[PDB]
Amino acid sequence: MKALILVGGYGTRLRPLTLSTPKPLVDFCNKPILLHQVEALAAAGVDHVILAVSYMSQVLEKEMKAQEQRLGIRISMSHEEEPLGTAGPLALARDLLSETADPFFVLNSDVICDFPFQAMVQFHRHHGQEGSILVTKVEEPSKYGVVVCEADTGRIHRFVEKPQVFVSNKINAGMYILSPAVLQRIQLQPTSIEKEVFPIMAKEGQLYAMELQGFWMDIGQPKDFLTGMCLFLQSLRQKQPERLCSGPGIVGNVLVDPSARIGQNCSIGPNVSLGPGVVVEDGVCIRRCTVLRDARIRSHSWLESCIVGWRCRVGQWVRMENVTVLGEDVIVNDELYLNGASVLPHKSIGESVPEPRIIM
Amino acid sequence: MLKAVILIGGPQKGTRFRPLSFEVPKPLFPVAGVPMIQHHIEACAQVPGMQEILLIGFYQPDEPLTQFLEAAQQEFNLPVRYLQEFAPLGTGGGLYHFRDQILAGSPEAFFVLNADVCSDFPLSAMLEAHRRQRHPFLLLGTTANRTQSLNYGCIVENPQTHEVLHYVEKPSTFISDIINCGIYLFSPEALKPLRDVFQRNQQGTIRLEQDVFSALAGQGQIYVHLTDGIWSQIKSAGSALYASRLYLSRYQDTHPERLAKHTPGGPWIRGNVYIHPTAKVAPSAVLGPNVSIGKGVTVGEGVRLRESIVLHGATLQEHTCVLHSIVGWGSTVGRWARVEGTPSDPNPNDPRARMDSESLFKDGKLLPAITILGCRVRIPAEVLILNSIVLPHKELSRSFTNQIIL
């Protein structure tokens, strides 16, 4: 079988981070979020995954052809020249997967979760109908599309795309298996599958629901990115307690890349991911923060719950908080304070930003 | 023979625009390391023939004030006395009520100094002009902005004879740019017109600027001596910090042993920094410009202090950043904690800008200014205090921003 990852056009979400690289290329726990999904797809045994991107990016082509060899499967990349929504990807991929009559995978790129793919294909085989949806129960159904859940059978009574009806607290999980028969139903003109195909497919009752076990989180948006990393480290501690770094001056669940160096007398707090090649000087306390690669954090500085961009230089005595995001090659002067400030790349910062605005 | 009268205020009359200290008197507040009236006492003791120094004000004699008098008397080898008014008698009422204590000994002239001014104190230059002309009132005068002059007392003078022709006190409209600096020289005849004002009050309290200066102006009795040096008024917390900066820059000419040297083996010092001998600062700490440290302060490893004033006995732990803030005595700042304030300052484009002071609320909104920590305030670890006034004996547990913490 085959698997279609919807990369798509660049989003307004996570925009200061993804001005340099595409959104599926940013390092999430030292791995791109392309990599996590294609990792678990390689464990699933799919020989052909396909990315539907809406603007061609040569660095993305570089990276996919590089990972292509060691991953062991062939990768085809089909390009949307004008965005057809998210339903139109299957319409352009129709001639690319029409040769096999075998149910295929579709994933969103911005979801990070435990991947139950063999249980997914067992659920899809047992229910026997065309469309199988994965869903999850969460906190707030107001950001996602809410479904209705059944008994043992699991047939979806009704699908709603947009909130404020509050029929359940379950949401869509962003990964499905679709049949070759529903791919007849979708036309080639632009529409969106989650809103407009699922809403007429739920009327007959072909759609079924399967609920996720652990730690589903969308990471398209930066404060969702930080809580998704913090939720990833919990299950990573339970699954791989050997990968997580343990130290005398380290508290909580910390993952450090082995290229990274950390000075003494400094307290790395809980749920912190340090990228490959970061230089953390001494006396720096970092909690709930992800530092991307090549970033040098000078001494005596404090950082709680932020994202530090690539090849960045944070000055001394700098306090950052409230998920402040720094772009690629950002210089922060000494003794500044940043609170809620998304910073565009290649810009030095000379003034305190106590109030959460985007900087030039 | 000359004595000098320092008009320290009372407790109600301070009415602080930002309370620099809740528990110590305002005239004993340490500006640039030493108390605020110790600058007046030292500059008066440098003047030849200074017999005595009197302090008139209606503070009750708490033991801090009397203990300061114990210290100053044996420090400068001058008798320094405290004469307490029975009631708040105004600026010039306390001078008239205590005329027997000032006039005793028959001084040739006597200085009157406001306690809240921070100045050059060119008392010898005023004394030379007074010995030249022997006129009853001599006023120090400074040049100010057209907007800033409405806060002080404006003086219109004859430019040739240096005599006041008109005086007005905090006018609604612009009058003149010269402002009264709160430093005067009084001949012994000058207690005679004050007495006249007292009789008009019977038909107790004499305001010196409004009743004596603003009435006798132009009649040949008041003369202004213009001056050049540094002058500021210590009204609020931010103006106290700016006055401390002015004194630390003035220290190079008079007391080079007071400023901390560069000391590459010890803590880093940029700019003018006063560190007390009893205070122990770790060698990794770096203290930025215009920073005063008090007696018994234990500045920890890795601290950055810029534009601050640390009172006696405060402790700052590791990796803390303190910018534009007054730290009260005995206060504890935990590690990785940041105490920040906003330096309102003075305009950099204005030619003569005098750094106004504003009373805590612009138009019903709290305005950002110097962070005040009260006495024995415990700031916990890894927490941010921003633009705040913290009352004494209060231990915080979370970060506060733009708030008065009761």
Ligand SMILES: Nc1nc2c(ncn2[C@@H]2O[C@H](COP(=O)(O)OP(=O)(O)O[C@H]3O[C@H](CO)[C@@H](O)[C@H](O)[C@@H]3O)[C@@H](O)[C@H]2O)c(=O)[nH]1
């Ligand atoms: N090929 C293609 N893919 C696209 C396009 N636009 C978006 N995608 C991919 O589709 C995914 C969803 O993009 P969003 O626009 O952020 O969707 P959403 O508002 O978050 O809502 C969707 O995802 C939620 C979970 O994250 C779901 O709960 C919800 O039902 C819906 O499907 C993203 O990973 C994006 O890469 C496109 O034009 N073309």
Ligand SMILES: Nc1nc2c(ncn2[C@@H]2O[C@H](COP(=O)(O)OP(=O)(O)O[C@H]3O[C@H](CO)[C@@H](O)[C@H](O)[C@@H]3O)[C@@H](O)[C@H]2O)c(=O)[nH]1
């Ligand atoms: N003994 C006594 N002293 C007092 C009293 N009230 C004030 N003082 C002291 O007298 C000095 C000035 O008192 P203010 O009445 O508050 O004057 P101001 O508003 O600060 O302005 C005065 O000083 C300016 C410079 O500081 C001058 O420019 C201005 O003309 C005026 O003289 C202060 O040190 C204050 O402590 C009092 O009732 N009794």
